[PDB]
Amino acid sequence: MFENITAAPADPILGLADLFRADERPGKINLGIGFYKDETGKTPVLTSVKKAEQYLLENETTKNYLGIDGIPEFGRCTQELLFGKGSALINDKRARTAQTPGGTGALRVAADFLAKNTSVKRVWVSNPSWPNHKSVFNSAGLEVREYAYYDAENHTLDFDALINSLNEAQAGDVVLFHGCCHAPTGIDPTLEQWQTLAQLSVEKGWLPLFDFAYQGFARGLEEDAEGLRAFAAMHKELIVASSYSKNFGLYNERVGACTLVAADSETVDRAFSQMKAAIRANYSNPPAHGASVVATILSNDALRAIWEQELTDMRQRIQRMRQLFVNTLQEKGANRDFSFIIKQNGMFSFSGLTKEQVLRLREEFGVYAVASGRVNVAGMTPDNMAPLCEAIVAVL
Amino acid sequence: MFENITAAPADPILGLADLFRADERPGKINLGIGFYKDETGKTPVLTSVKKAEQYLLENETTKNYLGIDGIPEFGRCTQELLFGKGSALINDKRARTAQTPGGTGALRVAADFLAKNTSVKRVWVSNPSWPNHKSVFNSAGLEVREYAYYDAENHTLDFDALINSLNEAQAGDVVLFHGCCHAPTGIDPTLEQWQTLAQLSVEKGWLPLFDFAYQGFARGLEEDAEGLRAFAAMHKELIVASSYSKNFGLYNERVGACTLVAADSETVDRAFSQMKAAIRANYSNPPAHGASVVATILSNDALRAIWEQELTDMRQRIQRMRQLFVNTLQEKGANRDFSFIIKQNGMFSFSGLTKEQVLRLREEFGVYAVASGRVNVAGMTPDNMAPLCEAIVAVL
Ligand SMILES: *Cc1c(COP(=O)(O)O)cnc(C)c1O
Ligand SMILES: *Cc1c(COP(=O)(O)O)cnc(C)c1O
């Protein structure tokens, strides 16, 4: 039965992880990680979550199943974070939120719901984009298409190419957008661009699907939601897959949400019932722990204040490293421009290095990066900054 | 887009839950729950898990992503629980285990892996069976077929009808088996029957898929694995979806495993890589909490001893209620036989009541049961036993 099953393709980032471990060299740096690290090169569990976990340990009386859509407070809290405390979408009750196993799980339930309950056949993804996108949509039976986004030459958002390729999308096609901190470029549309993208979206009849995994990492919680809120003000329907893996440092507890927005409550309720049928046929109901921690933090003034402070700390550290990187390279004698690094958001960016450069950088200096030249800024610390930049300068 | 989406069918057990809440009557009993309850009608978090959770709270240093297959110790521990501490399957390394979001999630990843990596098209399910089975398999694109199992007249396993209908299954067809405490009948094959079922299974070329959600609820941890171990000794390949929701009282933390067994390590590794690709396209990686709690209990002699004692306590309570039920009915004057209740395992059984009987039992006595006459024995307490049986006798 399984005797002729061909092996699945080796995951390139996992392959890197191994090579890094097996590296005897002491001064090795790893910039192809995919998560946050502080100045110590550690990914601690936030103090606000430790507090919330002590609270749960002392107050939980049962581990009985949650409803299909999860914890009610968690849903309410994510909707406000997404649309604003007094949004009409919330007052008119046009949105329903289902707690899912992480942001990836939210995308998959959207995919299954979309594929079995609507007429969608294609999903438009940016080029480049977070790698796992295709497989999620493709396993649900949807076809994936790509629209232009990155300008390799000038290192920016090729708005023209974006809009041009996106016009080949037909009405009823789903268009996926990164809410903020676009992965892997760190380049986000400006507000005016989001506004024209929403208006255009309405004319052509796209079904927007927002992947929101870094709210709080670009400018702030509310600032980062601006784009989505520009779309939500104009659209009668949309879907948003959110993740709390990075902003709450809860990676392994799988906490995210899938929010559906329809023209009215009657329609959102009917559509939501099918989204619940999709969940039931998958994992039945969601993991309480991680989501329970998020709901108690967000609903407690004291705990939320601490959390918000921890998040800005992370944001600022990343903002600090991008700046340090740029001018440390500018000190070692770069005779090349890397100033674009300061204009990008989140922990990712394309360094502009070639595969051969990243390869010798690894074998000759122990600096590990992804073949595409993608580097994670959270892998840089004010201590490894000098040896890093010297290696960069040596291969330029 | 969603404007013409038809609502999903109302879940009958959820509908019951509501009617029960809205019942003004004081002496109401609920036998259509689906989970365990102690003498107080409560579903507490076990003492061993509370201890393990205190341990984690004080020892966790990061919430970073687990590997696709989850915690390594958790996998090792479930394999021993399943196949025995020194099984050849473990020594020869023919099995790989992936931690999944609950037992339902294990079935879904098996479904997706099966549908996209093999030639399976049909899955044979017992009649009756746990309701959600069909949707899991059907959403993965597999067709579901049913084999006979229950003998309504004599209230037992219709082995003849079972084997007879199962011969229409072709080679390469998956046959689903409940490891123990068959839901919803509580009727399990005897060892000799499991042995003939395994031998037969080998001749016809079925791919056995075991759904193991109640290990420890029939006779004991090892006793309950006998059937699976009879099959594993003869088969070169099989799949087992396990759940820790009921035996660890961890319902909402979604903890289960999907174990793949192949002829050798080389083949199980190659097949397992595709199972991991399937997980990646779904929820990416599993929820650490619930599974972390299970792994620390199972690997600690002290904590495991307490847990094993808590599990037998649950088993015994259920065994006590079945006995009490039978002779309390036999005291109120039943002039009918319910002795079969004592011969069934787990918390479920068909009472033998008709839909009209269960209906008037509800509206006239406040005793809520499923339309099929299925009752949950854990909903009975030595305190509600008399009023329960009086209602039963009144509608007979
Ligand atoms: C992290 C991430 C996700 C999914 O994350 P989970 O870890 O599954 O919550 C989805 N999309 C993007 C762009 C991400 O960065
Ligand atoms: C409880 C159960 C499952 C799945 O349970 P989870 O709650 O998802 O772990 C699967 N099959 C049967 C027969 C069950 O009783």
Curated annotation (Swiss-Prot), chains A, B:
User: Can you supply a Gene Ontology BP term from the record?
Assistant: L-phenylalanine biosynthetic process
What mutagenesis or variant effect is reported for residue 374 to F/Y? Second-order rate constants are reduced by >5 orders of magnitude
Give the first-level EC class, as a single word. transferase
Q: Which residues carry this modification: N6-(pyridoxal phosphate)lysine?
A: 246
Q: What is its main location?
A: cytoplasm
Question: Is Transferase set as a keyword in this record?
Answer: yes
Keywords, A to Z, come to: Aminotransferase, Cytoplasm, Pyridoxal phosphate, Transferase
Where does the chain bind L-aspartate?
34, 130, 183, 374
Record annotation: effect of changing residue 133 to A: Slight increase in maximum velocity of the overall transamination reaction between aspartate and 2-oxoglutarate
Q: What is the effect of changing residue 280 to V?
A: Reduces first-order rate constant over 25000-fold
Swapping residue 65 to F/S leads to an effect described as: Slight changes in activity
Q: Which InterPro entries match?
A: Aminotransferase_I/II_large, Asp_trans, NHTrfase_class1_PyrdxlP-BS, PyrdxlP-dep_Trfase, PyrdxlP-dep_Trfase_major, PyrdxlP-dep_Trfase_small
Q: How is it used?
A: Has been used to construct a 2,4,6-trinitrotoluene (TNT) biosensor strain.
Q: Does the keyword Disulfide bond apply?
A: no
Q: What are the EC numbers? A: 2.6.1.1
GO MF terms here are: identical protein binding; L-aspartate:2-oxoglutarate aminotransferase activity; L-tyrosine-2-oxoglutarate transaminase activity; protein homodimerization activity; pyridoxal phosphate binding
Family indicated by similarity: Belongs to the class-I pyridoxal-phosphate-dependent aminotransferase family.
* Subunit structure, interactors included: Homodimer.
Q: What is this protein called?
A: Aspartate aminotransferase
The encoding gene: aspC
